[PDB]
Amino acid sequence: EFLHELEEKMEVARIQLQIQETLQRQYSHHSSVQDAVSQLDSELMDITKLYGEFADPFKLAECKLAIIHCAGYSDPILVQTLWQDIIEKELSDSVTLSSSDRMHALSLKIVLLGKIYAGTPRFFPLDFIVQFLEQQVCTLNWDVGFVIQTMNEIGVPLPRLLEVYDQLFKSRDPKPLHLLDCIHVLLIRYVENPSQVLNCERRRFTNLCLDAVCGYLVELQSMSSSVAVQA
Amino acid sequence: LERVSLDAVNLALLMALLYCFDISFIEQKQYIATIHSRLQDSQLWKLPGLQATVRLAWALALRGISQLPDVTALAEFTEADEAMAELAIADNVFLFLMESVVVSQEEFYIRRVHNLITDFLALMPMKVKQLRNRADEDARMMGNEPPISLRRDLEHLMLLIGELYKKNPELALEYWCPTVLSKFVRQMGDLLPPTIYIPYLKMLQGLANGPQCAHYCFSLLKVNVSWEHFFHSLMLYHEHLRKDLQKEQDGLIAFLQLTSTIITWSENARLALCETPVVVILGLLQCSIPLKAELLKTLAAFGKSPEIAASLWQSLEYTILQTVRIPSGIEVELNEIESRCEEYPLTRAFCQLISTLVESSFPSNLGAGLRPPGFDPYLQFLRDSVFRFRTRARAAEKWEVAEVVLEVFYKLLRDYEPQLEDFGEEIIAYKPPGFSLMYHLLNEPMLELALSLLEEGVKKHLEKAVQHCLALLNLTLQKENLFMDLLRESQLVCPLEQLLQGINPKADNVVNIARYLYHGNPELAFESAKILCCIS
């Protein structure tokens, strides 16, 4: 239980470090209001205090998200609402030329937060999030696999991503040309990565319900194997 | 009869007593006069409620009898009738009617009672107004439920109607057929007090029963309170709720109960109500509310058979997608649904709506812009649900969720015309739900859950769940091959050997199926027979 208190402490402390780091970068801040840093370094703070006082006023959406992870706040509306803000903020800074540049930065921002939250489903609803991201990025130049690659990098497994994505595919009454493409990129990404999946029945595959794996599952069995993760 | 309060047996005597008072003329009226006098005296007995009712009933009748003026002139109304009736009301004469009505020789009872119910409308209106006015004034702007209920006599009367009339359309028609009941309804429509208003909505729902009655109820609001006013109320509540961030739940729950009842039993009209409550109902759903499920149930009623599903699908996707942040993995998508559909009622409602929309169609590239498109994530969500189901609380509840799920699964199987292949298509093959459906079924609690339905069989409702279980398995066997070859390659996570060992190996299911061929329901037997063929 001592361990219990220690670990929670480490987590909260880490958050302050992150908030502290951002404060430096932020240009909205004044050096004389050093007091905030003094407060940050000075002690552990209440989560609500950290959230209400710091995250909201300084619009650190990522921090807010991570904090709520630790809190374990489930409420989907609030969690999603926070996500909307982060995405919206991202749009503001962008100019267009950096479609690729923003593409990277966007993936960078998401992956970082994603790594921290991804273990839990509440902040990182993979199902809800994927489309949301695609939709956001859609108003940008596109290369297939851009959306999914971030989640893979986020720490999400190929197997987890596959089932949810397939559900997204089949579940939607609609065109989802985008999903088809991305899944196509995903399968291609996956087969090359493990040696297990590797080979010929694949090249033909240009995403459809012509699931190579689906066929495989029918005959041999559903047992893919252990989870495969990106190295 | 007094020397019975709870004893249900009292109901047996109500036919004789109701009709007896109905035929008071037969008595003489030296006798009738004597009874009247004795009853006024008898007000001593509060403990016997049912005495109080019957007496009150006698009064409702007596007033009519006094029509031959020899009797009426003799009596003074205030002393002779109103004072006593009022006393009876105070002594819970309405409450016990409500009980008689709620806890429903049927012909004699229904006929005699409906005569009773109607007599009260026509002859009694003075009492109704007296009570209504009394109620409006009585409460003052911490009320306990008991305090709310004390004065509630008018509402109780409305409920009396609701219970008695419910089903029975026959009886219900009487209200609508001619334009005093029809007056009664108009009158009730006028009573503004929030509680009266909500019971009025409920009473009408009961009245809406036949396909025919439902139609009149549609016209009642549309033509001669309007539907628009109703949605307006819902809209207003919505704003108040959100701006803010029991009384309302009563009103709203009633509002929804009513819209649901009619929309279900209607035709082309459905579109009209649909366009209008659809927009407002969608907005209400966004708000938390206890209620969420209920609006989903109503929305579903609105959903039309044709192409014009699209507004509804967008609402649903938008209403899961909006808050959620989806990473490029699957889990984040599940999270979107889980966050929003927090409680059990929310889920059941969601399932009913989804069952309806999935019945036969949806938009292409659904969710485009926001997320990886397509129907697939919804099916994944069911993993959250029917995976879980096994661990319900509350068998009734488990069955409630299981059933919609089976119906949906079966629908998706039928969702693609397999025959075209055996005897941009690629994209179409990607979009159909049959794909994700098969994918999950192969995922061996999925197969198991479906399987257990077969293992443990036999209320009647449960029987249906069983039939669905068989039909689905049969369907899977028939087209298991099609999925593996044609469908899976196109749209090309994983494959098959798992369900077979379990179905085929695992024996009990096979034996259970064997037992089924004989047991009458041809659907279960005929299908059971087919399956063993497919397994072999």
PDB file of N, CA, C and O in Angstrom, chain B residues 194-205 230 247-261 294:
ATOM      1  N   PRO B 194     -49.074  20.179 -14.172  1.00  0.00           N
ATOM      2  CA  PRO B 194     -48.071  19.312 -14.723  1.00  0.00           C
ATOM      3  C   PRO B 194     -48.400  17.871 -14.513  1.00  0.00           C
ATOM      4  O   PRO B 194     -48.256  17.093 -15.452  1.00  0.00           O
ATOM      5  N   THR B 195     -48.843  17.500 -13.302  1.00  0.00           N
ATOM      6  CA  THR B 195     -49.200  16.145 -13.016  1.00  0.00           C
ATOM      7  C   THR B 195     -50.441  15.793 -13.781  1.00  0.00           C
ATOM      8  O   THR B 195     -50.541  14.700 -14.315  1.00  0.00           O
ATOM      9  N   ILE B 196     -51.452  16.666 -13.880  1.00  0.00           N
ATOM     10  CA  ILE B 196     -52.619  16.230 -14.612  1.00  0.00           C
ATOM     11  C   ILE B 196     -52.227  16.037 -16.039  1.00  0.00           C
ATOM     12  O   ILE B 196     -52.631  15.073 -16.690  1.00  0.00           O
ATOM     13  N   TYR B 197     -51.391  16.955 -16.541  1.00  0.00           N
ATOM     14  CA  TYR B 197     -50.969  16.964 -17.907  1.00  0.00           C
ATOM     15  C   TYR B 197     -50.300  15.652 -18.208  1.00  0.00           C
ATOM     16  O   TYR B 197     -50.648  15.006 -19.192  1.00  0.00           O
ATOM     17  N   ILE B 198     -49.344  15.195 -17.368  1.00  0.00           N
ATOM     18  CA  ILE B 198     -48.672  13.944 -17.625  1.00  0.00           C
ATOM     19  C   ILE B 198     -49.635  12.777 -17.562  1.00  0.00           C
ATOM     20  O   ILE B 198     -49.632  11.976 -18.495  1.00  0.00           O
ATOM     21  N   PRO B 199     -50.453  12.597 -16.544  1.00  0.00           N
ATOM     22  CA  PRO B 199     -51.437  11.574 -16.683  1.00  0.00           C
ATOM     23  C   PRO B 199     -52.351  11.640 -17.858  1.00  0.00           C
ATOM     24  O   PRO B 199     -52.783  10.583 -18.317  1.00  0.00           O
ATOM     25  N   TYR B 200     -52.659  12.834 -18.372  1.00  0.00           N
ATOM     26  CA  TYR B 200     -53.481  12.919 -19.538  1.00  0.00           C
ATOM     27  C   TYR B 200     -52.750  12.252 -20.667  1.00  0.00           C
ATOM     28  O   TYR B 200     -53.334  11.493 -21.437  1.00  0.00           O
ATOM     29  N   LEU B 201     -51.433  12.503 -20.783  1.00  0.00           N
ATOM     30  CA  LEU B 201     -50.684  11.921 -21.860  1.00  0.00           C
ATOM     31  C   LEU B 201     -50.737  10.426 -21.756  1.00  0.00           C
ATOM     32  O   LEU B 201     -50.911   9.739 -22.760  1.00  0.00           O
ATOM     33  N   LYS B 202     -50.597   9.879 -20.534  1.00  0.00           N
ATOM     34  CA  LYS B 202     -50.600   8.455 -20.359  1.00  0.00           C
ATOM     35  C   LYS B 202     -51.937   7.877 -20.713  1.00  0.00           C
ATOM     36  O   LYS B 202     -52.008   6.848 -21.383  1.00  0.00           O
ATOM     37  N   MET B 203     -53.038   8.541 -20.307  1.00  0.00           N
ATOM     38  CA  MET B 203     -54.335   7.964 -20.522  1.00  0.00           C
ATOM     39  C   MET B 203     -54.568   7.802 -21.995  1.00  0.00           C
ATOM     40  O   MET B 203     -55.108   6.788 -22.434  1.00  0.00           O
ATOM     41  N   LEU B 204     -54.148   8.794 -22.799  1.00  0.00           N
ATOM     42  CA  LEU B 204     -54.369   8.784 -24.217  1.00  0.00           C
ATOM     43  C   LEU B 204     -53.616   7.654 -24.851  1.00  0.00           C
ATOM     44  O   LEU B 204     -54.066   7.076 -25.838  1.00  0.00           O
ATOM     45  N   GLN B 205     -52.432   7.316 -24.310  1.00  0.00           N
ATOM     46  CA  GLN B 205     -51.604   6.285 -24.874  1.00  0.00           C
ATOM     47  C   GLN B 205     -52.416   5.026 -24.864  1.00  0.00           C
ATOM     48  O   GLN B 205     -52.437   4.271 -25.835  1.00  0.00           O
ATOM     49  N   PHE B 230     -46.244  19.503 -28.169  1.00  0.00           N
ATOM     50  CA  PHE B 230     -45.549  18.481 -27.444  1.00  0.00           C
ATOM     51  C   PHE B 230     -44.074  18.542 -27.705  1.00  0.00           C
ATOM     52  O   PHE B 230     -43.284  18.472 -26.762  1.00  0.00           O
ATOM     53  N   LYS B 247     -40.115  15.814 -10.926  1.00  0.00           N
ATOM     54  CA  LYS B 247     -41.298  16.280 -11.595  1.00  0.00           C
ATOM     55  C   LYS B 247     -41.095  16.206 -13.071  1.00  0.00           C
ATOM     56  O   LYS B 247     -41.988  15.776 -13.798  1.00  0.00           O
ATOM     57  N   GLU B 248     -39.917  16.621 -13.563  1.00  0.00           N
ATOM     58  CA  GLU B 248     -39.678  16.620 -14.978  1.00  0.00           C
ATOM     59  C   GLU B 248     -39.649  15.211 -15.477  1.00  0.00           C
ATOM     60  O   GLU B 248     -40.139  14.924 -16.565  1.00  0.00           O
ATOM     61  N   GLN B 249     -39.083  14.275 -14.692  1.00  0.00           N
ATOM     62  CA  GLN B 249     -39.030  12.932 -15.187  1.00  0.00           C
ATOM     63  C   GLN B 249     -40.428  12.435 -15.381  1.00  0.00           C
ATOM     64  O   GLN B 249     -40.710  11.754 -16.365  1.00  0.00           O
ATOM     65  N   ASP B 250     -41.353  12.780 -14.467  1.00  0.00           N
ATOM     66  CA  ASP B 250     -42.699  12.309 -14.636  1.00  0.00           C
ATOM     67  C   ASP B 250     -43.216  12.815 -15.947  1.00  0.00           C
ATOM     68  O   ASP B 250     -43.681  12.038 -16.779  1.00  0.00           O
ATOM     69  N   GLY B 251     -43.110  14.136 -16.191  1.00  0.00           N
ATOM     70  CA  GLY B 251     -43.690  14.696 -17.378  1.00  0.00           C
ATOM     71  C   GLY B 251     -43.041  14.134 -18.612  1.00  0.00           C
ATOM     72  O   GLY B 251     -43.732  13.692 -19.528  1.00  0.00           O
ATOM     73  N   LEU B 252     -41.695  14.117 -18.662  1.00  0.00           N
ATOM     74  CA  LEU B 252     -41.019  13.665 -19.847  1.00  0.00           C
ATOM     75  C   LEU B 252     -41.280  12.218 -20.090  1.00  0.00           C
ATOM     76  O   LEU B 252     -41.529  11.813 -21.221  1.00  0.00           O
ATOM     77  N   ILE B 253     -41.265  11.393 -19.031  1.00  0.00           N
ATOM     78  CA  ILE B 253     -41.435   9.989 -19.246  1.00  0.00           C
ATOM     79  C   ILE B 253     -42.767   9.761 -19.893  1.00  0.00           C
ATOM     80  O   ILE B 253     -42.900   8.902 -20.763  1.00  0.00           O
ATOM     81  N   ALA B 254     -43.796  10.514 -19.466  1.00  0.00           N
ATOM     82  CA  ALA B 254     -45.118  10.382 -20.016  1.00  0.00           C
ATOM     83  C   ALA B 254     -45.158  10.821 -21.443  1.00  0.00           C
ATOM     84  O   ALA B 254     -45.810  10.193 -22.277  1.00  0.00           O
ATOM     85  N   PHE B 255     -44.459  11.924 -21.758  1.00  0.00           N
ATOM     86  CA  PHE B 255     -44.448  12.476 -23.081  1.00  0.00           C
ATOM     87  C   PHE B 255     -43.937  11.422 -24.010  1.00  0.00           C
ATOM     88  O   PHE B 255     -44.534  11.156 -25.052  1.00  0.00           O
ATOM     89  N   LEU B 256     -42.812  10.783 -23.642  1.00  0.00           N
ATOM     90  CA  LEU B 256     -42.227   9.766 -24.465  1.00  0.00           C
ATOM     91  C   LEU B 256     -43.108   8.554 -24.542  1.00  0.00           C
ATOM     92  O   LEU B 256     -43.236   7.951 -25.606  1.00  0.00           O
ATOM     93  N   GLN B 257     -43.762   8.170 -23.430  1.00  0.00           N
ATOM     94  CA  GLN B 257     -44.525   6.954 -23.451  1.00  0.00           C
ATOM     95  C   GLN B 257     -45.582   7.056 -24.506  1.00  0.00           C
ATOM     96  O   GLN B 257     -45.844   6.093 -25.227  1.00  0.00           O
ATOM     97  N   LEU B 258     -46.212   8.237 -24.612  1.00  0.00           N
ATOM     98  CA  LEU B 258     -47.269   8.522 -25.543  1.00  0.00           C
ATOM     99  C   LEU B 258     -46.813   8.535 -26.974  1.00  0.00           C
ATOM    100  O   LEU B 258     -47.456   7.943 -27.840  1.00  0.00           O
ATOM    101  N   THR B 259     -45.690   9.217 -27.261  1.00  0.00           N
ATOM    102  CA  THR B 259     -45.215   9.326 -28.614  1.00  0.00           C
ATOM    103  C   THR B 259     -44.879   7.952 -29.087  1.00  0.00           C
ATOM    104  O   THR B 259     -45.139   7.591 -30.234  1.00  0.00           O
ATOM    105  N   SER B 260     -44.277   7.150 -28.194  1.00  0.00           N
ATOM    106  CA  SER B 260     -43.894   5.818 -28.535  1.00  0.00           C
ATOM    107  C   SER B 260     -45.100   5.019 -28.918  1.00  0.00           C
ATOM    108  O   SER B 260     -45.124   4.388 -29.974  1.00  0.00           O
ATOM    109  N   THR B 261     -46.167   5.070 -28.100  1.00  0.00           N
ATOM    110  CA  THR B 261     -47.287   4.207 -28.335  1.00  0.00           C
ATOM    111  C   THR B 261     -47.857   4.453 -29.704  1.00  0.00           C
ATOM    112  O   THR B 261     -48.139   3.504 -30.435  1.00  0.00           O
ATOM    113  N   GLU B 294     -35.306   5.729 -23.327  1.00  0.00           N
ATOM    114  CA  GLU B 294     -36.656   5.890 -23.757  1.00  0.00           C
ATOM    115  C   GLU B 294     -36.700   6.666 -25.029  1.00  0.00           C
ATOM    116  O   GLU B 294     -37.440   6.297 -25.939  1.00  0.00           O
TER     117      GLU B 294
END
